[PDB]
Amino acid sequence: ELIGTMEQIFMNVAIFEDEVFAGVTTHQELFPHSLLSVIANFIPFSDHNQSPRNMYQCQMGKQ
């Protein structure tokens, strides 16, 4: 399915499987890194760096 910004507030969307439940978890996300931008998906292991850094990586990869 395709959901919108206002339609997403009234529905449960698991990220990883085994997070899906029976009554809860109406939907599920395609990939776990769907939340991140195209450039933020080019930073390696962004999960183990602190966030002000990864945000900095996005501005330095464009210079």
Binding site: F16, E17, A22
Partner: protein, 51 residues
């Protein structure tokens, strides 16, 4: 010979067309979960010391 108001209706029927819900199967993903990165079998050292 004209039209006059008749007795008030005693009830109302509202019709709509509706289909039903299927069973909950919740088939989340084709190849599901985040499959883990892993070891290539055997591998072997690709480097040796001198001497």
């Amino acid at each position: 010979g004209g039209l006059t108001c008749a007795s008030a209706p005693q009830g109302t029927l509202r019709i709509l067309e509706g289909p039903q819900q299927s069973l909950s199967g919740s088939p989340l993903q084709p190849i599901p979960a985040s499959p883990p990165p892993q070891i290539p079998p055997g591998l072997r050292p690709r480097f040796c010391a001198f001497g």
